[PDB]
Design a protein around this ligand. Sequence first.
Ligand SMILES: c1ccc(NC[C@@H]2CCNC2)nc1
Length: 460
Amino acid sequence: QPEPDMITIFIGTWNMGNAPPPKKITSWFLSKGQGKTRDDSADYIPHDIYVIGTQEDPLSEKEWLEILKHSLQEITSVTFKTVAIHTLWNIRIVVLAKPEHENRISHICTDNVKTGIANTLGNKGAVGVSFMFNGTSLGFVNSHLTSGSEKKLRRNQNYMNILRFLALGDKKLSPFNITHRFTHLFWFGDLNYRVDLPTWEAETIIQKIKQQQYADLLSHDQLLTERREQKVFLHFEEEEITFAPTYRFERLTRDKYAYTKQKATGMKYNLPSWCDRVLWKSYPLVHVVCQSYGSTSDIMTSDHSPVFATFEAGVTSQFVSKNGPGTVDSQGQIEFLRCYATLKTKSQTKFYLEFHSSCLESFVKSQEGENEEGSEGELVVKFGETLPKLKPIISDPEYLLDQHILISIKSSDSDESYGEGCIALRLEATETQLPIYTPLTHHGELTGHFQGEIKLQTSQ
Ligand SMILES: c1ccc(NC[C@@H]2CCNC2)nc1
């Protein structure tokens, strides 16, 4: 049986509003309702991996696992295997996979982050799961961020705390947060960003939703506007939204948005909003295609509607040669020419690089670069032709061209990363000098750039 080069992944996010689900939730897993929906001809085809994120989930892990597995069984006639389940308070993630994948999945990690201090520590945060699927790392984060139209800055702070402190993936990648540890990272949940229009406009907003005219509402969606201004989710993607706002509904119908201030809302308005979202970030030049993004219309136990997203995701096989793993393939090398880092830091320390990749036996430390002053104020750290020659474990170009190099630029004084980025080895040519580029981030904020040239030698 050949190993796959593609898999399909289902992502669901549902704020269940502390209520048990209805008896049938199959529309969710079938990507049926409003938005970008899945073709009827695919209904019997199982996804490879189903990742279910809930918020305000009132069920025990056992109760929810039984509903999920039963649902998938009814749709597909496949008994899914549980990869992982992790719950923080009422925030939960479930990962289910087809039984044929059981021995393709390894290195399963789970973690949680609690957001806020004192007052604000008590029910918001994130859960996550990572694992390897053959040669591909996959990470999944379900977050329930701070509620309320006037707390977008809190939400952005919650996001930064989650991507700093959630401990998933390979712990040897010590300079790197979850935004660099995975071939494919999916981040979803009740992100709680709102449509930021005046309260008085509530009935007008409802009118626009009934006409399926979302453009003037999405232009005021706080997640899109905060993303635009590089305040949150830098370098993440989201598929175009073509479904009605998923919050806040009257229960047991979808005919009514419940937006008016009530004692039960802390006297806050809940204008109709896209609270419930799926975003992703994949390494450069890896195949990832969103094939559905929408909301269900027939699941009405909560004041939110479930959201679905599905993806085609490129995967690679575990590689064994006569040489690596356990030695170098002398036929392989990665050389960096004319490289320099441009940093936003005001500090004056020396910097060195670390190169991390699963194509190396272990990470590689460079010599210190030479600091110069940029024309517009900046620190430029020059490496020239001084960077070490990297010695991959396998030289086969069908392996090596699928790999990536993670780069950290570190202070010599503190050994603290000032910036992290990623370079694809999916080059237009081998044995040829070609431009390379990555932005550098730290704690998910832009801190600079790394650019230069690469020269990759493979066995071909
Ligand atoms: C908010 C922020 C950005 C954005 N598109 C630009 C990205 C550039 C790389 N892919 C899309 N859209 C909304």
